[PDB]
């Protein structure tokens, strides 16, 4: 039932144990698929799919490869300088969440969020870096230094507003054959632990589905039983998913209940399991 969205999410994990020990690791997601991997040990961004470069030429990919190499070295050098200036103690952990989403015909949406020790400190907005609603005093000082760099502001603007929506459309076109993949789930009913004395737990398992958009509801014929506990969509190594949907019901009201599964691979033929 849910709409399949395809934003490009470029994630960066930078750890600083001491002034001497550091590593920068990253990856790229196109929706729920991982297209790229980036280790501190390698000098290039690793392609995971045969269609990961998109419609970009070898020359265009090399320019990005160059920007990421210069960025990592520069980023890892700037944090050490900032920690010395703003008197910030090690260990340090910085996270970057950059990317965009393409809306064919209409204007594209972009983002660049930076977190410090799991909390939002700043983000790129329009043509400059901007602090979070509530941000420590040392963030405003780091922003004063960061906003003085005309070149980085222009590189980030050009990467987000220009390069990124182009790259997304290229991936959507080069990987389309793999993006239309459908993997039918296996479903079954079970009785989970007793939640109360005169009550029982109904469990509906949906296993091995791809893509991730799914709909699972406990039903009384056609009446949607609000009180369905969907839980987390858990991952499988083969890129398929797992989901459990439970329902707390007092003994007797379990009769006439069913579980309705809606998924794209089912081609309209919903899985309906009666308890």
């Amino acid at each position, epitope marked *: 039932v849910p709409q399949r969205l395809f934003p490009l999410r470029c994630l960066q994990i930078s750890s600083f144990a001491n002034s001497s020990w550091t590593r920068t690791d990253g990856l790229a997601w196109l929706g729920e698929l991982q297209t790229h991997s980036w280790s501190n040990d390698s000098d290039t961004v690793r392609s995971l799919k045969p269609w990961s470069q998109g419609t970009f030429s070898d020359q265009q990919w090399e*320019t990005l490869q160059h920007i990421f*190499r*210069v960025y990592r070295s*520069s980023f890892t050098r700037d944090v050490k300088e900032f920690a010395k200036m703003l008197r910030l103690s090690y260990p340090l952990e910085l996270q970057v969440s950059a990317g965009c989403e393409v809306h064919p015909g209409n204007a594209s949406n972009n983002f660049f969020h930076v977190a410090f020790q799991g909390k939002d400190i700043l983000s790129f907005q329009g043509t400059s870096w901007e602090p979070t609603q509530e941000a420590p005093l040392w963030v405003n000082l780091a922003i004063q230094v960061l906003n003085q760099d*005309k*070149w980085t502001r222009e590189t980030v603007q*050009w990467l987000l507003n220009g390069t990124c929506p182009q790259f997304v459309s290229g991936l959507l076109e080069s990987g389309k054959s793999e993006l239309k993949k459908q993997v039918k789930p296996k479903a079954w009913l079970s009785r989970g632990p007793s939640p109360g004395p005169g009550r029982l737990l109904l469990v509906c398992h949906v296993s091995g589905f791809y893509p991730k958009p799914v709909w699972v509801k406990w039903m009384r014929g056609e009446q949607e039983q609000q009180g369905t506990q969907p839980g987390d969509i858990l991952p499988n190594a083969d890129e398929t998913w797992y989901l459990r949907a439970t329902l707390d019901v007092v003994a007797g009201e379990a009769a006439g209940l069913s579980c309705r599964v809606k998924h794209s691979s089912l081609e309209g033929q919903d899985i309906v399991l009666y308890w």
Partner: T-cell receptor
Amino acid sequence: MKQEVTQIPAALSVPEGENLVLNCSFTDSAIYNLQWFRQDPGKGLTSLLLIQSSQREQTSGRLNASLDKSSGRSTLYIAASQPGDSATYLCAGVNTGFQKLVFGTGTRLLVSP
Amino acid sequence: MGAGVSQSPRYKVAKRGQDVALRCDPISGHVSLFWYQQALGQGPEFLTYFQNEAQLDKSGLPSDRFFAERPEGSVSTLKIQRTQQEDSAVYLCASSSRDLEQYFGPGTRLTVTE
């Protein structure tokens, strides 16, 4: 796409006092800055003018240099040319996520007295 | 200029096959260093780029014979091993701050002869 900087004309012999125009074209419009240089035989670059991506025009003495990213063009105007201006004039650009200058081949300018 | 980039040797005549070393003393405090190659009646062509001590762009380097260094983030040397006639050129060195407005040295005129 690899940046290609082109300068028209390759050579120009002009009489003293004349207002001359030097052309520069580039295929990649994602420019960080554009730098015009002067070079005397046989080595050493003298910085003349620098136009920033936001900037449209820059002046200094008898020199005026315009930048048009959308048409991929830069012009260097020399007012009331003197024999002392006689040199090779080079146009170069730095692209948005780059550091290196990509240069044209140059205009060999000769201003006869 | 008085307080600019220095290069040495200003002129070098080398025998074919010999090793040559070219030095560049950038403007004090300039984080960025660039090497360029300029052939006779041609525009300068980028060789390599240094940001502090790191050689972050080596795309212009023609072959294995060309190797550049800047170990202390100041002085840079460019070494050409087993020099050939085609290596004859002006080697220009430049330095800049973060604005990337490049200040060029007087260059090294290298002539490689039999």
